[model samples]
Target: NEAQQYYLDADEAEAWIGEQELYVISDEIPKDEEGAIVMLKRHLRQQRAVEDYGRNIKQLASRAQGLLSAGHPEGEQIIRLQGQVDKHYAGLKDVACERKRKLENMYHLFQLKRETDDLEQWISEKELVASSPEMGQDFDHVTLLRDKFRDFARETGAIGQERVDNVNAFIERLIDAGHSEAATIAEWKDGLNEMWADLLELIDTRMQLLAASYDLHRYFYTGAEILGLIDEKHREFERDVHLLGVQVQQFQDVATRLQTAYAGEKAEAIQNKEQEVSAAWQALL
Candidate 1:
């Protein structure tokens, strides 16, 4: 009956099936992102539009088995004849398999684009805050702005620092996997670090400006008062040391008086002067 079916269609099936085979890429994978895009669409179009030919290769194998059972003059030689059908079927399967591999590469490429784009935009936005041109106008204003800036620095620095580690790990995974787009993605990774480091440096530079201005204004009046005390005491110490032997009582009294006079300034500037006074008296002893 149908045992003779394979005898007729052997060459015919091979001819049509070879012609009907879908192809993913005849040569190498794409070299660039744009090229990859075009190739990816081609693969997807075929993937969605077509399927395995001739109902299934299994149906062809079944027909071949039936022909073998018939004991034709050529005997069970249908096994040898069905070999081309298996080969053509495999060629069709190859298209989808290669399509899967190439499609995954494109997925990673686009994902890298998305993440890198996001990070770059974030850096640009933070740059706006980091590079603020306004220095405060006065003592209170400088202090107020610095206070607010410190809070900003704390919050952004924390988040920005965390982003660095996150991106570092993300890039490492791509690189370790030997991803196709590793070169571009790694370059973008360094760009993020470079840009972010500059942002931090700018933040520090601005903080220093505000801090220097804040300190000057903070001690402005109290500093003036302390300088006045040191001036009078300098002459007194010199006069007493030059004419009289060390005036220990006068030195002690002078130190005690100056200690409580300057109100706001309590650190280095006042201490240095106190030591200067003591050093003068120590010259005698």
Candidate 2:
């Protein structure tokens, strides 16, 4: 009866598995071929003595190549096992290198994504401000942040090219809008200051005119003459009071606009000024 080929295949597979375990410990192989052969065969007697997977198997293949090159009595076996070891070691290195690259790419991608999202939200809010009447023309901080985003993309190489491009475009738009927003706020503050000054002057003039008119009216009442003069002076007092009321309303409106426009760091000054004017206006009233 012919022998079944299954036994031959099984024997080859078992030998190959044994060879893999040999290559794993080939790192401990000696420099001298004779000692290396003896050490390898000793470990082969008890396969469990050497680790198959859990050991540092990086230099095993190269070490085997060195032993094989030195010419050994068991050159045939050493040559065969070295080839297997070298192939396996090469594969491990390739896998490890690729995994390292993948990990780096993913880490950077996440970091850049988070940074861009924050900047995008800020830019959106800034754009809305630019659209408002109080928008300013010079936003240095916005420009600086945009520069940082661009620099990060270039330095890290973590962000995808397409996403970086999109972020840049969004940042560019924000830069323009932010500058305009700054300018608008600056102009509003100046206008508010001027209007408040004029209103205060008007209020002072009105008070003075009122006091004088009352004194003159009292003097005329005491005398027995010029009844028409009293009527004319009373009409002038009415006109001056009406104009002062209009001035106060204008002052209040300007202060409110300034407070609204100056929303960030510059807002404190406008806020204090608004409070001061309010108190003064109330006392006058």
Candidate 3:
């Protein structure tokens, strides 16, 4: 009965033990129980900070999923955000363990029980915050993604099939309840970058071909007949101009898609260049 009574008393004491002495005899259980309460208070404040951190990470994860869905090449931000989440989580676990040990030695049974319970619940919340999107909470992930995709696709532009496939692939993963690992996110981000680079490379190649076509145009009217070479050169020039026209058309489509999806000077500049090249192709034809 004495042990049972002590247990009940200990439980009650924990509920209101802040700034009070523990029931344990001071000499045998000789840590400052009041100081432990102060430590626990600080631990709770830190836990709130950790929660805020988790929310920020969720926001970034949402952003990454958004970019990927829209066929935008900005998934790199999401990968970097995952690293921040992992690093912060590692530090939080270490702090939780250290604080648990400190509270164990510093508090009596009732106080220790309160903190241990708090610790378990806190960790559970952390797990939910960190990984809930993977299980099924990606409804918001999808909603945000659709909104972003529609926003990018709002205006029609010349988006290449390869680029379109990349965006849809990421969207499918999210729709299928795929969770992002840090490495996987990073890899996708890189793939997005390559798509971006390919578009730029196509534009550069198109410009070179256009210049070659223009050079042939200047020589077209000055041609002199020779050992059947003149006709061959004229045919080759026509093929070159035809290829240039195709490149310009492709660039025009790409520019429109980018202008619809991207913002700022780059999109504007690309659209202007596309218009110029489109006009040149039509004029030459």
Candidate 4:
């Protein structure tokens, strides 16, 4: 019974070995990364299956150790077969391990590329906004645009810092992992930081330009306001001068008529009328 069982186990171990020998572990990285990752995961399952498969052979090899102690015929051959199959299984495991590492490298590389692309896109949009030339119609409008740009700058810094921090952390992890594309990713990180610095300077220049525009518009607005006030006062002064001239003429005529008609009869009353007219002139002035 022991011999028959050992032979059956040997056959099964050889069958598993033959199946593994035909299995190809690929090193290729794919264009469709997500789908490629899924395929790699399936390949990982196959590696685990190899692990599962090893359990039986490993036991078969160890069992032959006992059979060799019993001095069974051909048990030495089983020991030799155990040696070959063990080497074979370990070699396959090594291949699978290398494949999985390739999968891991590609996955993170693509992820870094994806995040870098998105960050570049956001930077471009902000660049356009900062480069806008709309000066606005008035001080109020300019100030409104100024406030909006300030808020935009604040938000840009907040999000820009946040994004870079995440990407930098990601880069650190990839570097720590000793990823294959570490040099390339490191350069890309420098590129993003450079762009981010340029963006801040651009926003700073834009803010200065907007501020100068606001100052100019404010100067014009204040000039126009004061000019209107001067014009209004000029009109009131002209009207008052005309009214004073007319009233003075009317009083002079009355004094002349009274001097001719009652020159000597009411001189004191004429004096009082003249004094009242002078007081009215001072009041009007």
Q: Which has the better lDDT: candidate 2, or candidate 3?
A: 3
- The model with the greatest TM-score is 4
* Tens-digit lDDT track of model 3 for 1-285: 333433343344233222122221122332466766666666656545555655544554565455556655444644454455556555554555455444544543334335334433443443343222221123434444444433433221134434345454553443354333434444544554464455445444444443333333222211221212323434546676566556555555655655674468755655565565555445455
Q: Which stretches of candidate 2 lie over 4 Å from their true place?
A: 1-71, 134-285
Clashing pairs in 3: 157-256, 157-257, 158-253, 158-254, 158-257
**Better candidate by TM-score, 1 or 3:** 1
- Candidate 1 lDDT by residue in tens digits, 92-185: 6676666657666776677667767787798788778878877777777988999988888888899988877887887898789777778888
Compared with the true structure, the alpha-carbon lDDT of candidate 4 equals: 0.76
Q: Which ten residues in a row have the lowest lDDT in candidate 4?
A: 222-231
Which regions of candidate 1 deviate over 4 angstroms? 6-20, 23-55, 62-77, 162-166, 221-285
Consecutive 10-residue window with the lowest summed lDDT within model 1: 243-252
Rank by TM-score (best first):
4, 1, 2, 3
Selected candidate, larger lDDT, 1 vs 4: 4
lDDT, candidate 2, 45-147, per-residue tens: 4344323432434344444455567675445565575566546545544444343333333333344345465544543443342232321123443344334
Model 3, runs deviating above 4 Å: 1-31, 109-285
Alpha-carbon shift of residue 200 in model 2 (angstroms): 37
**C-alpha lDDT score of every prediction, in listed order:** 0.67, 0.43, 0.44, 0.76
> Each model's TM-score?
0.59, 0.29, 0.25, 0.74
Q: So what's the TM-score on candidate 2?
A: 0.29
Sort the candidates on lDDT, descending order. Answer: 4, 1, 3, 2
- By TM-score, how accurate is candidate 1? 0.59
